[PDB]
Amino acid sequence: MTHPDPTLFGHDPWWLMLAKAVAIFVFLLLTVLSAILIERKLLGRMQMRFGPNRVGPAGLLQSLADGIKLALKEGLVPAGVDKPIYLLAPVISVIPAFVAFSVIPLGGAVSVFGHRTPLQLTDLPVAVLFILAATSIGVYGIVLAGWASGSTYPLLGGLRSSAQVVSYEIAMGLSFVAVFLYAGTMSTSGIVAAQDRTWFVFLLLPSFLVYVVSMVGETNRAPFDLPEAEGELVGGFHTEYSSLKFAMFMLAEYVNMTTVSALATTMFLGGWHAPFPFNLIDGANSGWWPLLWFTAKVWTFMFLYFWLRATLPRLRYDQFMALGWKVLIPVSLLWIMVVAITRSLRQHGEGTWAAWLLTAAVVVVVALIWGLATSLRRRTVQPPPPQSTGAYPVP
Amino acid sequence: ARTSTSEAVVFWVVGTVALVGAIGVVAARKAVYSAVFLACTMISLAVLYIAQDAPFLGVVQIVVYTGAVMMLFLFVLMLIGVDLTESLVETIKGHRIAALIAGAGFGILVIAGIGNVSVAGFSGLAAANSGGNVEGLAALIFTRYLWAFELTSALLITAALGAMVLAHRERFERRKTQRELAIERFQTGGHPTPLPNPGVYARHNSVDVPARLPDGSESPLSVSTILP
Amino acid sequence: MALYTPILILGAIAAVFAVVSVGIALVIGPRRFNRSKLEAYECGIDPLPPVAAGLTGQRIPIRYYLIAMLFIVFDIEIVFLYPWAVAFDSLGLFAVIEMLLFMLTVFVAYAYVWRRGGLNWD
Amino acid sequence: MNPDNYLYLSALLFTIGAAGVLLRRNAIVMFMCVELMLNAANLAFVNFSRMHGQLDGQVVAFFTMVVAACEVVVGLAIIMAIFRTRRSASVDDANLLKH
Amino acid sequence: TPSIEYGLLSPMLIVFGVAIAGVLIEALAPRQSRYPLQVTLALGGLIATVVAVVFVARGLSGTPGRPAVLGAVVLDAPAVFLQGTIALVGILGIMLIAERQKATVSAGEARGLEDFTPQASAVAGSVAEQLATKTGVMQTEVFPLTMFAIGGMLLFPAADDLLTMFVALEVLSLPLYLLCGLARRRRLLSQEAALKYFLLGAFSSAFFIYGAAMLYGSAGTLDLSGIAESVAAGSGNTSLALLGVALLLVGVLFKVGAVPFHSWIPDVYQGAPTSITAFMAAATKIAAFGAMLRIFYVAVPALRDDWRPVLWAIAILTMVVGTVTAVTQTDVKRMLAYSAVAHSGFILTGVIAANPAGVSSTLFYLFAYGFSTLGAFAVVGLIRNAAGDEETSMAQWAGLGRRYPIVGVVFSLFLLAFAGIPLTSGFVSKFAVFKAAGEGGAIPLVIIGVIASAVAAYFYVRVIVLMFFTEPPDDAPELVVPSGLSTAVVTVTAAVTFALGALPQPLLDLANSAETFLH
């Protein structure tokens, strides 16, 4: 009915909701450790290597080793930095990263210590935009870190972060529109419930693709990776940062990856609902199994991140902004129309017309985008004219 | 009228942050500090909106003002300076005192005009938000205020047109492409072939150091003309 | 209060974690003053004499300023879709047509910007 | 807490924003102060909407946000145009029209 | 579903659709054809609008107006009268805006006679600007912007809700902010004018919205009729109502140009393009005073005893400071701006009347004065120095009439209309407003306005002295026609100014019929 369901949310006792908050925080910490370790090992495998397999049994302690080493490493405060904002920027990056995850549905209702509570820290009438707002706040961490370092390379990194925001944020926002249309709510729990019949990834594929591209953009991950851009700006924004300040920038990056992958899972992959091979199994969607399914989907998205990093080079941030504004935003807006018209027609019994329009629309878009990829980006040009340098004779 | 003590504490802390943020926006000597304080004020006001049973409004505030303050910070770097510290010395004789007096008087008079209002009754918004705050906002926007909603499109078009007319530069001044610059009698590489690097000395290797010509004089071309 | 105090608790946990992490950075591990260490990283080259010109005491032009200005308005405008999207079923055909007209107006603006080279530069 | 406090805060914020427009030469800071003024108006609208048990004030706050964004963009365009010629973003620099 | 009165909204709908279509022309029309379509689209679009208005007027011969969009818009007789006035003034202003260079050997005439720089983003005097001028390029995006301004202004009198009124204020303000900075000549002054106008307009609009918030808190409603019901029934706070009325008055007074808020008008009118200044000084004044009329005759009549004393002072100041400051002015455009301030004061005297005679007098005053101001500024735009810049230095106008008797006589007619001499629409106009004020118990305002008019006649007459009684200087300016559109605008404006002076009962019956707002 109404989402968030008042019979489930807003009733956890102080101790239980504190326990859920601590559990979510610890889950994010463990997931960040695992994300780093598994990413390094998977990059190794995709590059025929083994990755960390010596620091602890099978390298399990490598991520913890790196974290504690950064803790045990000198905390630099370079001269010429805007010290207050320079020290705050890591905190500004971190806090929203954790906050955003508060409205992620990790599972359905479950009974713990005699209380029926959602396997979810909380839910809001506007939860998805709450996540978007938290992530948007988080980018000020990157930008102010770049600016406050008082050096050229961090400044360029922060400027690239701002450009990346301009590139991806509107597309991210427009991606949620179709999800809301089909779910009829902004609550994450309501969106998950709306996907009981089918996952929105099948229904809202263009929205899913735009959102995924915007996810990779938001997390400053390859092939976008612009604010860091190791090969270009040395360290990008987090240059001039060392020890746990850099550690916290990277922690915020990975927590953002996890949060936005979980948001993708919630909005498109049916949240915590069991996949088809397990959906037929009784009790799979109940109890603590939804946690397993949600983690599996989130980690498939993490695998997508790692695979993109291993396979693709990084775009120029002008090219990323061109992708955002000439492809992503127009595609998402056309899809928003198409979806609205389709749903309105279906609600009025038009039937076949919608089934036509939708297909035609996508048939057009994939062609038109192809043009931008092949026609607009012409691969021919005229020869240059000679000059005083007495050029040789060409073949 | 009274609000929940939790809401009272939320208001006190968050509105203290918002007031301090506005004061910083007005008083910060670095424009970037002003932008950061504006972001703080906007986020605090969003939290207050949430506290006042306007969740959608607060969240949208956070999102759009995060974007807008980011853009304003970009324009601060572009037009004022990366870390320029403004003087804030009154350039108009007696204007500072007069402005402070006028501001204080206006604020005092506005507060006096407001007086006690909630004493006249304070309806709980729970009745309206019942059925969804966003649902109610949608019902009002597209039924009672669809005209203003549509006119916001005219506002957007006017903003875009102004940007395109005043800020967008055109062909007569488009920067030369790397291909264009390379092809200028082969200017880029053969016309003063890549300029001599800044001189490298023991105790000095920065880009501001000119190179030494054979006669012992500093080569002008070694150091970029902009550098002091 | 409910439905938000969990967010407040998680935010408190995260803020304590982050501030304590900064404190640990500053307080755990060796600390040794060194002027070369503290000065700005410049790929190993000496930082420019402090002064101020053509950078920190100057401005860094962004060549996508136009797209930033457009981003402001477009971001603030699209948020109309969210209440429309959520209440779509309840509003009915009239609201669908109204939002389609609004979206077509936004499309006219976008097309004018795009076709007149507004999305050029960075 | 008495809800009317929210209005006083707005009255302060608006006031501060007004003072900012008088005190700061930078055009961008002037835009920030105008945004402060409009958001103080939004806070007053939200408080009154809560007071009257209806969402109309919230809708007005939304529309004020739209107006603030559009006005900021137009002001930024004007300031770009001025700066490209004068290489300055100070309001006091545009002093030619006088007396 | 919400019933939409498209017929009633046909005005402002033609205009906004035409503005959108003009933006489409900018987007996807070849350069060489952009201006012919835009001017064809703009002018025709306004002509249609005018027709729509009269049709709506006929529709209103029955019920005394009606809401259109479930509130938020009301087309009553005052609203339709003001919308027709604004449509006509917009037609004339666009005819001014579309004027190109008179002629040249090269075909690249670039809408310059209308003072519009070929590329506003180009640096003033830069090689890019010179090259753009030589190539004959010109930013036709001006025409859509104007439409939007007209659109917003057309809505501003008709807005029946605070939110819609605020949105219309912004919609008309932003295009004007942009247009004030597009002057072809003296680009530095035009950019300064645009910046000043933007800053002060944003300031005033912030005050406007804060006042709307105060009013909403007092009455718990945004509809003007609802606020009237709240204040009359005493259910409101009655302090927030007054504070909101004051803060809203701040915005509307800024738009009309009262002395506490007039300072922007001189600089903006001097710096802005002459055609844009001519169009704006009429249309914006008309729209702002229409909104003020709706506020003070629909929204808050009950608090007349509370806000009437304030307006008095404003009006008084506006009549005194507006006129006295004009006495020593040496610039024609700046002097006309101060005249606009003083005439805002004269309008406010009639608005204070708080009687149907006040509404009729204000409507007629706005019509006649919008026409007169548009014509005066159009004529000012034709006086060109040797360098080609609009010769506004009043001393340089010496002997101008002795060289151009037709234009000199037309400008003298406009000046005497501003001074309020009988046999000019300006006198009938001033008499209407002062009569309304006297009937409304404000005869002290009538006396003060009479003294202010006596003062202002001096600086209105000094121009005629220089034009006709003085010999031309050696380097005296010359007229640039420059095309049929400008001549048509000047002729129509002078003809209206003379006819409404000699034979005012036409359109005065129309103003009388528009004495009643829909409550």
Angle at CA B75, nearest 5°, toward B72 and B77? Answer: 115
Chain C hits for A73, Cβ within 8 Å: 29
Q: Does residue C30 belong to any structural domain of this protein?
A: yes
Chain A nearest-CA distance from B196, in A, is 21
Which pair of tokens denotes residue A272?
A: 């915590």
Experimentally, the structure was elucidated by cryo-EM
Secondary structure (H, E, C), chain B: CCCCHHHHHHHHHHHHHHHHHHHHHHHCCEHHHHHHHHHHHHHHHHHHHHHCCCHHHHHHHHHHHHHHHHHHHHHHHHHCCCCCECCCCCCCCCHHHHHHHHHHHHHHHHHHHHCCCHHHCCECCHHHHCCCHHHHHHHHHCCCCHHHHHHHHHHHHHHHHHHHHHHCCCHHHCCCCHHHHHCCCCHHHHCCCCCCCCCCECCECCCCCCCECCCCCECHHHCCCCCC
Q: Which of C11, E220, E129, B66 has its CA nearest to residue A136?
A: B66
Chain E nearest-CA distance from D1, in A, is 19
Separation CA E437–CA A281 (nearest Å): 86
The CATH number of the domain holding residue C107 is: 1.20.58.1610
The answer to whether the CB atoms of A162 and B131 lie below 8 A apart is: no
Tell me, yes or no, if B75 comes closer than 8 A to chain A by beta carbon.
no
Which pair of tokens denotes residue A257?
A: 């990856």
Tell me, yes or no, if B32 comes closer than 8 A to chain A by beta carbon.
yes
What is the DSSP track for A31-72?
HHHHHHHHHHHHHHHHTT---S-SSSGGGTTHHHHHHHHHHT
Tell me, yes or no, if E126 comes closer than 8 A to chain B by beta carbon.
yes
Q: How many folded domains does chain B comprise?
A: 1
Phi, psi of E479 (to 5 degrees): -75, 140
**Which residues have CB under 8 Å from E146's CB, separation 6+?**
E42, E90, E93, E94, E97, E175, E179, E279
Q: Which residues of E224-246 are buried (b: 16+ CB within 10 A; e: fewer)?
A: bbbbbbbbeeeebbebbbbbbbb
Nearest-by-CA chain C residue for E25: C112
Resolution value, angstrom units = 2.6
Query: Could you tell me how many helices (H) and strands (E) chain C has, helices first?
Result: 6, 0
User: How far apart, in Å, are the Cα atoms of B107 and each of A256, B103, E224, E387, E409?
Assistant: 42, 6, 26, 50, 52
Chain D hits for E272, Cβ within 8 Å: none
The answer to whether the CB atoms of C69 and D73 lie below 8 A apart is: yes
The answer to whether the CB atoms of E167 and D63 lie below 8 A apart is: yes
- A–D contact: 3+ Cβ pairs < 8 A: no
Residue type, B7: E
Q: Does residue C121 belong to any structural domain of this protein?
A: no
Q: Does residue C122 belong to any structural domain of this protein?
A: no
User: How far apart, in Å, are the Cα atoms of E50 and each of A324, E90, E458?
Assistant: 43, 10, 37
- 10 Å CB burial of residue D37 (0-12, 13-18, 19+) is buried
Among the partner-chain residues C6, C39, C89, the one whose CB lies closest to the CB of A17 is: C6
Tell me A138's DSSP state: H
SS3 at position E478: strand
Which pair of tokens denotes residue E17?
A: 């659709």
Angle at CA C60, nearest 5°, toward C56 and C63? Answer: 175
Among the partner-chain residues C66, C83, C112, the one whose CB lies closest to the CB of B141 is: C83
Q: Does residue C70 belong to any structural domain of this protein?
A: yes
The answer to whether A230 touches A8, Cβ cutoff 8 Å, is no
Separation CA D55–CA D64 (nearest Å): 14
The answer to whether E106 touches E166, Cβ cutoff 8 Å, is no
Chain E hits for B110, Cβ within 8 Å: 243
User: How far apart, in Å, are the Cα atoms of C84 and each of C79, C94, E305?
Assistant: 9, 12, 44
Domain ranges within chain D, ordered by starting residue: 3-93
Q: At the topology level of CATH, where does D3-93 sit?
A: Helix Hairpins (1.10.287)
**Which residues have CB under 8 Å from E166's CB, separation 6+?**
D60, D63, D64, D67, E205, E208, E209, E212
Residue type, B88: L
The answer to whether the CB atoms of E192 and D96 lie below 8 A apart is: yes
Which pair of tokens denotes residue A221?
A: 């991950």
Query: For tokens 């909101």, what's the residue?
Result: E244
Separation CA D9–CA B105 (nearest Å): 15
The answer to whether the CB atoms of B66 and A155 lie below 8 A apart is: no
Chain B nearest-CA distance from E448, in A, is 29
Find the domain containing C111 and state its range: 4-116
Q: How many folded domains does chain C comprise?
A: 1
The end-to-end CA distance of chain D, in Å, is 51
Among the partner-chain residues A124, A136, A143, the one whose CB lies closest to the CB of B63 is: A136
Query: For tokens 């939200």, what's the residue?
Result: D46
The answer to whether the CB atoms of B131 and A2 lie below 8 A apart is: yes
The CATH number of the domain holding residue B17 is: 1.20.120.1200
**Which residues have CB under 8 Å from C32's CB, separation 6+?**
A74
Q: Which of A66, A112, A99, A229 has its CA nearest to residue A161?
A: A229
A74: left (phi over 0), alpha (psi -120 to 50) or beta: beta
Q: Which residues of A293-313 are buried (b: 16+ CB within 10 A; e: fewer)?
A: bbbebbbebbebbbebbeeee
The end-to-end CA distance of chain B, in Å, is 65
Query: For tokens 């922690």, what's the residue?
Result: A251
Strand partners of residue B226: none
Find the domain containing B121 and state its range: 5-171
The answer to whether C9 touches A13, Cβ cutoff 8 Å, is no
Q: Which of B20, B53, B66, B207 to mutate to test the interface with A (most CBs of A within 10 A)?
A: B66
Among the partner-chain residues B81, B153, B163, the one whose CB lies closest to the CB of C58 is: B81
Separation CA A126–CA A187 (nearest Å): 6
Contacts of E among chains (3+ CB pairs under 8 A): B, C, D
The answer to whether the CB atoms of C73 and D65 lie below 8 A apart is: no
Separation CA E367–CA E362 (nearest Å): 9
Tell me E480's DSSP state: -
Among the partner-chain residues B117, B120, B166, the one whose CB lies closest to the CB of E178 is: B166
Chain C hits for D87, Cβ within 8 Å: none
Tell me, yes or no, if B73 comes closer than 8 A to chain A by beta carbon.
yes
Residue type, E73: V
Q: Considering only CA atoms, give the Rg of chain C.
A: 25
